[PDB]
Design a protein around this ligand. Structure first.
Ligand SMILES: Nc1ncnc2c1ncn2[C@@H]1O[C@H](COP(=O)(O)OP(=O)(O)O)[C@@H](O)[C@H]1O
Ligand SMILES: [Mg+2]
Length: 292
């Protein structure tokens, strides 16, 4: 049978190869469930004499098959999407002579989540973290998410921790470890018995194992929630078990963060519709924010 040749499944381009002995490691930048990211210098990575600052991502030692496969999966994705201001810029990989190193544009402020909590105790509006800044990050992630979707991709792990921030208040989406290309169906079904970011997951994906374009929309909602609560954990104190699953199904949702404006809560909520086909598309979120 016939398939849309999936760009993110394609064997790998050796044009990204950058010799690892030209890299050097500084302090650790973060670590999620999949990889470890470390700060670095890449000598001669763009200009023959660069000394560029970068983020290098690599498997954590004693990583499993899943972690392994995923790191390659995001090399391949990052590759396919290419430069776009709001996605994380891929600049290289090292696959030869040591562990897979995935080289990324360094974002100097880190994950919104962490950034939010360092600057929560300093939040104001009209000017330091702004309300305009929070709006600005809402716009930029929706903008970037609307871009993935046009490129037939679903992130599958949109969360505050997987959004980076660089200098011009410019935000970059990262962690394409769970991202898949959806052109073939849309309804992408999770095969593995997986270990997933459940509190960011739309009910249809939890219960019926189906992710769609409008299921990143759900997570983007939990992310507007993270954004405007100045970095709170979703459903704080709430373990993921039957009590949590049941409150999602029966349709219960989080309240407005004390710092969210009415229209942003309104978007979140429509992002949280039980009916997948009632949620707005990021394209519509984008335009919903540009009226603010
Ligand atoms: N390009 C980068 N520049 C700066 N920090 C980064 C970069 N990439 C990742 N990080 C940091 O490392 C953390 C883990 O990155 P991520 O790709 O989500 O790894 P994981 O798959 O393990 O979650 C992020 O939340 C962020 O703090
Ligand atoms: Mg992460």
């Amino acid at each position: 049978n016939y398939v849309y040749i999936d760009p993110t499944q394609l064997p790998y381009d050796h044009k990204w190869e950058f010799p690892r002995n030209r890299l050097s490691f500084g302090k650790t930048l973060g670590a999620g469930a999949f990889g470890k990211v470390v700060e670095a210098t890449a000598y001669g990575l763009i200009k023959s004499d660069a000394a560029m600052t970068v983020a290098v991502k690599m498997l954590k030692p004693s990583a499993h098959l899943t972690e392994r496969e995923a790191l390659m999966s995001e090399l391949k994705v990052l590759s396919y999407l290419g430069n776009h201001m709001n996605i994380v810029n891929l600049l290289g990989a090292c696959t030869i002579g040591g562990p897979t190193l995935v080289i990324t544009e360094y974002c100097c402020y880190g994950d919104l989540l962490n950034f939010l909590r360092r600057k929560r105790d300093s939040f104001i509006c009209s000017k330091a973290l702004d309300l305009e800044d929070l709006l600005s990050f809402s716009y930029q992630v929706a903008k970037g998410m609307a871009f993935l979707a046009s490129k037939n991709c679903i992130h599958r792990d949109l969360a505050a921790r997987n959004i980076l921030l660089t200098h011009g208040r410019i935000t970059k989406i990262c962690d394409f470890g769970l991202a898949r290309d959806i052109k073939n169906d849309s309804n992408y079904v999770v095969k593995g018995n997986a270990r997933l970011p459940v509190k960011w997951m739309a009910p249809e994906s939890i219960f019926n194992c189906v992710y769609t374009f409008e299921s990143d929309v759900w997570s983007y909602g939990i992310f507007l929630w993270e954004l405007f609560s100045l970095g709170s954990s979703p459903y704080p104190g709430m373990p993921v078990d039957s009590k949590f699953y049941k409150m999602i199904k029966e349709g219960f949702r989080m309240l407005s963060p004390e710092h969210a404006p009415a229209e942003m809560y309104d978007i979140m909520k429509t992002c949280w519709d039980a009916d997948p086909l009632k949620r707005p598309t990021f394209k519509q979120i984008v335009q919903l924010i540009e009226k603010q």
